[PDB]
Specification:
The structure is cut from a larger assembly and holds two copies of chain A.
Chain A lengths: L49
Chain lengths: ~50, ~25
């Protein structure tokens, strides 16, 4: 790695984020807020995605 | 030595609950 090297030979930093989708409880969530819960009425539910 | 693994070694293949069903 020299500064005069061609871009193909220049250093690149790489980060790979790996996550498995919904099959169990979760601990990494997005910024979405929450709301109270209502029963005995047809509603749109979104539990952990 | 050897022994017979009668019916042991079955484990929940998924972390999803099910009930009263025969799942393959």
């Amino acid at each position: 790695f020299q500064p005069t090297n061609g871009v193909g030979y220049q250093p690149y930093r790489v980060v790979v984020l790996s996550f498995e989708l919904l099959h169990a409880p979760a601990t990494v969530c997005g910024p979405k807020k929450s709301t109270n819960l209502v029963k005995n009425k047809c509603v749109n539910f979104n539990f952990n995605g | 030595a050897y022994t017979n693994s009668f019916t042991r070694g079955v484990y929940y293949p998924d972390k999803v609950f099910r009930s009263s069903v025969l799942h393959s």
